[PDB]
Amino acid sequence: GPIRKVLLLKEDHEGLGISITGGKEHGVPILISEIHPGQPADRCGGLHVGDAILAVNGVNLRDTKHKEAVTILSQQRGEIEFEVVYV
């Protein structure tokens, strides 16, 4: 599908509210496998199961290993911009 830019607002006591799978070491993008109900990703409205996370706050995630992506994603605070695509 088309590449989308999506804004997520997270409070500091929260996680993102997603499960991710995949990573470069598996030859698969960082993929959203779960959107947890009521948590920030669900609330933002624009992130969905099956979306590949291409970048977050300008950090490319296309070639990142799984754990690299976890570190990068979990670092982000407040108003967080995602670049995603549903394939």
Binding site: I18, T21, G23, S33
Partner: peptide, 9 residues
């Protein structure tokens, strides 16, 4: 199990 590892974040 997921096809590949999964992390909740």
């Amino acid at each position: 199990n997921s096809r590949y590892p999964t992390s909740i974040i």
